[PDB]
Homo-oligomer: A and B are copies of this chain.
Amino acid sequence: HMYQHHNWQGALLDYPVSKVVCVGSNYAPEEPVLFIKPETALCDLRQPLAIPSDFGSVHHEVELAVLIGATLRQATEEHVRKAIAGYGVALDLTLRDVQGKMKKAGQPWEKAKAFDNSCPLSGFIPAAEFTGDPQNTTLSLSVNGEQRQQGTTADMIHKIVPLIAYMSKFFTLKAGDVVLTGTPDGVGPLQSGDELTVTFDGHSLTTRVLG
């Protein structure tokens, strides 16, 4: 239980940890593709990153993370709005090789998208403390000095409150849950020893991969 919710400063928030609901592709329609990362996959983005080594390449997906503050079931956008508790950044770490086998087989994705620590996550910035428009926020990821992902929240197909509203249709989001909103173009592979710095609207963190 290493991971726990906290603001940017590092102080703990009064929200449990539980699940992370994620969107398939959401950057440039057909209903949003949905999958879920378990509590086990959550981890501090500020500490070294632990990646599997015997399952094939591991890709990085920088994404905007929305922290739910109250329960949403078959919710309306007004409810979503009032409920989101903050924003931060995450890496929708995924085992591409494994996923390909899964897709071709029409099989669950948990092996490729839900393995341990497959969701490093930054601290959160309180909803009414977030300077700027979440729907128009900058997302970037650089690996060893080279920027590999750059985009803005405005390029999302399904916006933030609509997507969350849609998600609640299949799974009730309780407070403490996190929502990954998709990744921009530029998804790449991660390797032991790489140093990577993630960034979203004026905020940055730099960590490294172990092996």
CA of A105 to CA of B30 in the docked complex: distance in angstroms?
12
Question: Does A56 belong to the interface (CB within 8 Å)?
Answer: no
* Nearest chain B CB to A203 CB, angstrom units: 29
Contact residues of A between 1 and 36, Cβ < 8 Å to B: 18-19, 21, 24, 33-36
CA of A10 to CA of B115 in the docked complex: distance in angstroms?
33
Please give, as numbers and ranges, the residues of chain B lying within 8 Å of A36 by CB-CB distance: 36, 38, 108, 110, 114
* Nearest chain B CB to A180 CB, angstrom units: 13
Evaluate contact between A170 and B105: CB separation under 8 angstroms.
no
* Nearest chain B CB to A3 CB, angstrom units: 12
Evaluate contact between B170 and A111: CB separation under 8 angstroms.
yes
Question: Does A41 belong to the interface (CB within 8 Å)?
Answer: yes
Evaluate contact between A108 and B115: CB separation under 8 angstroms.
no
A-side interface mostly: loop
Please give, as numbers and ranges, the residues of chain B lying within 8 Å of A108 by CB-CB distance: 24, 33-36, 108-109, 113
Q: A interface vs B, CB < 8 Å?
A: 18-19, 21, 24, 33-36, 38-41, 73, 102-111, 113-116, 170-172, 174
Can you add 19 more A-B contacts, CB < 8 Å, to A18-B18, A34-B111, A107-B109? Answer: A19-B38, A19-B39, A19-B40, A21-B110, A33-B107, A33-B108, A34-B108, A35-B109, A36-B110, A38-B38, A38-B171, A41-B171, A102-B106, A104-B106, A108-B109, A110-B170, A115-B170, A116-B171, A116-B172
Q: Please, could you name 15 A-B residue pairs with CB atoms under 8 Å apart, sorted by A?
A: A19-B38, A24-B107, A24-B108, A33-B107, A35-B108, A36-B38, A36-B108, A36-B114, A38-B38, A73-B116, A103-B106, A107-B109, A111-B170, A114-B170, A116-B170
